[PDB]
Design a protein around this ligand. Sequence first.
Ligand SMILES: [Mg+2]
Length: 505
Amino acid sequence: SLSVWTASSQERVRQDDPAGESLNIELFAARGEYESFQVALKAPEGEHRNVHFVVSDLKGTGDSFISKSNLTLYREHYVYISESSPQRGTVLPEGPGWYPDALIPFIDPATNEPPSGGELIAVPFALENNSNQVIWVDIQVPRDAEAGHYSGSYIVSSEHGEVTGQISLTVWNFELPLKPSLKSTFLIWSSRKKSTVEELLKHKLMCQQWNLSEEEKGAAPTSEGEWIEKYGVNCSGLGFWSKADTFNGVMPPPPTVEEIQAAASAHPSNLFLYNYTADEIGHYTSLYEPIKAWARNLHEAGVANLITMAPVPELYDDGSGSGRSAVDIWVILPLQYDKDRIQEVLAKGDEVWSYNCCVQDDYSPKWQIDFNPIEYRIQPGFINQSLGMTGILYWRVDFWTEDPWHDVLTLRADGMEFNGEGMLVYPGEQVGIDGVVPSIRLKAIRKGIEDYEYIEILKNLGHEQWALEISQSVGPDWHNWTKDHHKLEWARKQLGERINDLMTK
Ligand SMILES: [Mg+2]
């Protein structure tokens, strides 16, 4: 007895969930966009020792065709959380238990062939009594794909079972740019491989190396031109760190204009440059004059100043006489949001970005594994657009425990435990490959970056307010945002149908 059903991308499938009602999926997407779905499996009676899973090509009218090479398959790995993330307010974690999060790849990206010799293998796999298994399916729509309807199949098979489900995909007559409109800064502290950067870029996230040795500080950004071409890299940091942080309220004099210009000229031209100058120093009012000194030198070199602090009117003028702010990219937590200050800085030409960590308030989306999966998607797209925010930052992606496939309690502090804090990718060793593999949460971030793009496209077409009415219906602010994946899917489809229509006049 083999029970099969589908689930949407941001639907969590628990090991003990009952079987759903459909084993088909219907999706909609633009050229250059991903859409994903899950195939959940249960053996209500007995066991299946040897379960396999394949997909077809997707075929449309006439010669229209999307190769199965555009589909990426993974088996979900469940991790056991024994200590809850903090429980406060109305946005709560779901409790100790098994959570699907790491993704076991069918294919090693290095070879384009199945891994061999891993401790954990995607297929074949055993389906044991009552504990569900789940396949994650990514579909990347080719940049050139013909608009219209496509269909294909997935096949689950075992020694006593074979079940075939339909994949239905509608390709809309628009494209998402290779270069994401949303800018980002996601920090890598430990895994210095080019495959680590590439895994993040494939998910539309821009990264910077952090905690670099004095020796490797200032190495030349050798690969950046390649990554612009291949992955649409949309910004880069110069790496002048002041060392000022929450614990260190002191700033030295800035690097000279000449030094900043030399750093800038190592990067490709026609690339937005910023400098992450200081972190969470909003309490230290002594630092305002030093921040303006840094700003003036960066501005003379055509470089943007990025600080994780909230807009303060004392820093709306860098002291140069131009009227430009001392901070060009203000990066804030949900809890720091102040509508009036944000309106002031957007009006004068600055950017505001969001960042997240820990569990610091009662109401905002929280980035831990034991929270609703929607919280990783809703922040970069709908809420950011509702509030006029134009980027996202995250402090670390590789904060692994010593047993990273089995222990995801990555931070313990002040009597609190955090599940997945600073960890969005998993090491490949456990699945027999050299490079990192993605999490389910990284897939949600990617999707939210695509949601942002839908809204940006409508803004660019002259339909900003129309798009914000929709955005504000599901994610107006940090307090009031939907917990229901169906409503976000509904909102996205309204946006996508409209763009389709406007491009087919
Ligand atoms: Mg505890």
